[PDB]
């Protein structure tokens, strides 16, 4: 894993395909995405991140306002039993 970024850059067939390393840029994009996800989303909010390959220009983040769909998404993500477990944890807190 730690040798692959050096292995691709040091290949003899194409020494200079690009002057900018794609792997470090990928890691930076990953970190920027993580930071944006942490900063943008607030408490008790349900959001949607849809990537469209037709655009390939920016990432769009939307809010969910339909209570039924929001509850369905929550139930798909957070099962009921975990909800009561976190509820009793909150009561202890």
């Amino acid at each position: 894993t730690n040798d692959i970024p050096l292995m691709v850059k040091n290949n003899p067939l194409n020494e200079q395909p690009k002057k900018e390393n794609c792997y470090m840029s990928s890691i930076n994009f990953y970190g920027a995405v993580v930071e944006w996800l942490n900063e943008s989303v607030k408490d008790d909010q349900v959001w949607k991140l849809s990537y469209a390959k037709r655009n390939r220009q920016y990432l769009v983040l939307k809010e969910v306002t339909d209570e039924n769909e929001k509850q369905q998404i929550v139930d798909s993500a957070i099962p009921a039993w975990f909800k009561e477990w976190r509820s009793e944890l909150r009561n202890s807190e």
Binding site: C22, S25, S26, I27, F29, Y30, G31, V33, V34, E35, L37, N38, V41, K42, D43, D44, Q45, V46, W47, K48, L49, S50, Y51, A52, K53, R56, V64, Q72, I73, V74, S76, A77, I78, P79, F82, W85, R86, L89, R90, E93
Partner: protein, 192 residues
């Protein structure tokens, strides 16, 4: 486990593709295992964790490879609860993806089954000293499915953010290390 000499057998990766099994995409996309592990660690510790982001390995790989792997489309849902963010796939878009999926030719299904069969042949269900011969040579007739899988719930750190990731581990190198489990992990892939 995969010796060098096994390659020389010219083993075809299409034996048994007609009875391949596929799990439900919606069922596998749920964050149930991560929440179960979080409840267990919360009960053991008794204090709320400082982790912020909860996710799978594939979602974050899509989010990392997006600029240079821009040939696939996806939609994700994020739910905020107790100050923690849980992200997963979007159910209606996943159903639309399955709708697009049944139109895939049997060649693509054979390729996916070839990858899974390679994973079956290159792994063992037990440590090598504890495996028997029958468990080794019967991997050619072993049924392949996407349902049964092993995962690791791993805490990682990016800048000031602690991310708890559930990664599907194909296998380990030779054993399990209780000190640094990540150091012995190994996965498998297939390519033209």
């Amino acid at each position: 486990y995969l010796p060098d000499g096994d390659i020389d057998n010219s083993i075809d990766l299409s034996v048994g593709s007609k009875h391949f099994l596929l799990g439900d995409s919606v069922e596998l996309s749920k964050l149930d295992p991560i929440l179960l592990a979080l409840k267990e660690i919360e009960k053991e510790s008794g204090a709320k964790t400082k982790d912020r982001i909860i996710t799978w390995r594939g979602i974050m790989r899509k989010l990392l490879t997006l600029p240079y792997d821009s040939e696939e489309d996806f939609v994700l849902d994020v739910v905020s609860f107790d100050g923690q963010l849980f992200i997963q796939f979007n159910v209606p878009y996943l159903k639309s993806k399955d709708v697009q999926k049944q139109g895939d030719t049997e060649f693509h299904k054979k390729l996916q089954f070839s990858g899974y069969k390679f994973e079956k042949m290159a792994t063992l269900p037990k440590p090598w000293p504890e495996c028997t011969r029958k468990e080794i040579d019967s991997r050619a007739k072993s049924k392949c499915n996407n349902i049964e899988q092993y995962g690791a719930i791993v805490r990682t750190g990016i800048s000031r953010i602690k991310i708890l990731i559930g990664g599907a581990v194909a296998c380990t190198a030779d054993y399990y290390d209780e000190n640094d489990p990540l150091s012995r992990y190994i996965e498998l892939k297939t390519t033209r």
